[PDB]
Scaffold this active site. Structure first.
Site, PDB file in Angstrom:
ATOM      1  N   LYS A   1     -55.303  14.551 -35.894  1.00 43.07           N
ATOM      2  CA  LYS A   1     -56.210  13.552 -35.136  1.00 43.07           C
ATOM      3  C   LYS A   1     -56.196  12.235 -35.821  1.00 43.07           C
ATOM      4  CE  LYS A   1     -58.494  16.522 -32.436  1.00 43.07           C
ATOM      5  NZ  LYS A   1     -58.686  16.367 -31.000  1.00 43.07           N
TER       6      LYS A   1
ATOM      7  N   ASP B   1     -53.808  13.708 -21.623  1.00 43.63           N
ATOM      8  CA  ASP B   1     -54.881  14.837 -21.940  1.00 43.63           C
ATOM      9  C   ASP B   1     -56.102  14.475 -21.090  1.00 43.63           C
ATOM     10  OD1 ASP B   1     -56.752  16.708 -23.144  1.00 43.63           O
ATOM     11  OD2 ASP B   1     -56.879  15.632 -25.038  1.00 43.63           O
TER      12      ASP B   1
END
Ligand SMILES: [Cl-]
Ligand SMILES: [Cl-]
Ligand code: NA
Ligand code: NA
Length: 322
Positions: free
Chosen positions: A135, A215
């Site tokens: 991340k 996404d």
């Protein structure tokens, strides 16, 4: 229908300390399950909208699920638009008919949790293909760039999936990139949504040679599947998408364009995660899914993820609505 019956459960799973999403504290994961029965046939689904990502709330999903169940019991299974409810209900229906295959591989891209050394030790001697997820965009860009660089340097055959969730301005994205050795950039499998705008993400991809993935874009009204310079993949989160049929259509559209399609977690409970593992093995057999989110939770429910050491609650322990 004399043959049909259904059960609906409500639950809250405690999260480990330190889970943050879009400037939020996810202290518990709240959701629902539906269990459908028709004769000797049974099927389960998870309905768990994700705060800050789903448009609908837990409470709205509860009402929609209950009313959908009421109609199903009377012979009408058309699905609602609400994505978490459409997803969960569709999985239960697919389990009843046996359309959702039983098989799963139960492997996911390991998620870095602040200790790159541990991740290195975990992957450095893994036989076969090495893929991990980091991340980015939480810490400052310089930090993320150095972490990515060190991991790629430590393991020569490691490929990294990076997830920014539209964290960066064009400047910050360039600042991240400057710390990643160009010799290693080809081993970024993809960087999900680096910039605040899609046009800036595409410009970043073309400028840096770092591959990108969509996404959250997939959930925008305007979204069209397109082969584009620098775009290598799409990330499909069924809980945020909708029905299994819609998920199938999206995977198919991505594959038809030569894009990688990754089945991905919306932090579902273990039950939903095992279903996502089955969905991934079925629709994206060649692609490791993004399902390494169970360790963020303190309990499993109904169906355990193989190998998890977390306690698993039985259905009798959950709050029954119907
Ligand atoms: Cl209520
Ligand atoms: Cl159970
Ligand atoms: Na079944
Ligand atoms: Na993402």
């Amino acid at each position: 229908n004399a043959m049909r019956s259904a059960q609906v459960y409500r639950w809250q799973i405690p999260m480990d300390a330190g889970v943050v999403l879009r400037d939020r504290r996810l202290k518990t994961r709240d959701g629902l399950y539906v269990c459908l029965r028709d004769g000797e046939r049974e099927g389960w689904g998870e309905i768990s909208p994700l705060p800050g990502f789903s448009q609908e709330t837990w409470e709205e999903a509860q009402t929609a699920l209950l009313t959908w169940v009421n109609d199903w019991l009377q012979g009408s299974e058309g699905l609602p638009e609400m994505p978490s409810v459409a997803f969960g209900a569709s999985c239960a229906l697919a389990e009843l008919t046996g359309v959702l295959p039983e098989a799963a591989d139960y492997r996911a891209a390991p998620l870095c949790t602040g200790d790159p050394d541990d991740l290195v030790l975990r992957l450095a001697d893994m036989p076969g293909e090495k893929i991990a997820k980091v991340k980015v965009g939480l810490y400052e860009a310089v930090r993320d760039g150095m972490v990515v660089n060190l991991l790629l340097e430590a393991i020569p055959d490691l490929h990294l999936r990076l997830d920014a969730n539209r964290a960066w301005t064009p400047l910050k994205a360039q600042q991240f990139a400057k710390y990643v050795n160009p010799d290693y950039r080809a081993r970024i499998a993809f960087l999900e949504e680096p910039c605040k705008t899609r046009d800036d993400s595409r410009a970043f991809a073309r400028e840096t040679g770092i591959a990108i993935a969509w996404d959250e874009s997939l959930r925008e009204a305007d979204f069209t599947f397109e082969a584009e310079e620098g775009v290598r993949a799409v990330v499909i989160k069924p809980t945020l998408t909708g029905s299994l049929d819609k998920v199938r259509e999206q995977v198919a559209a991505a594959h038809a364009l030569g894009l990688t399609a990754v089945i991905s977690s919306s932090i579902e409970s273990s039950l939903g995660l095992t279903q996502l593992a089955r969905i991934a093995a079925w629709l994206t057999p060649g692609t490791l899914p993004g399902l390494d989110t169970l360790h963020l939770m303190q309990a499993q429910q109904i169906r355990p993820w193989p190998g998890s050491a977390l306690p698993c609650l039985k259905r009798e322990e959950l709050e029954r609505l119907l």
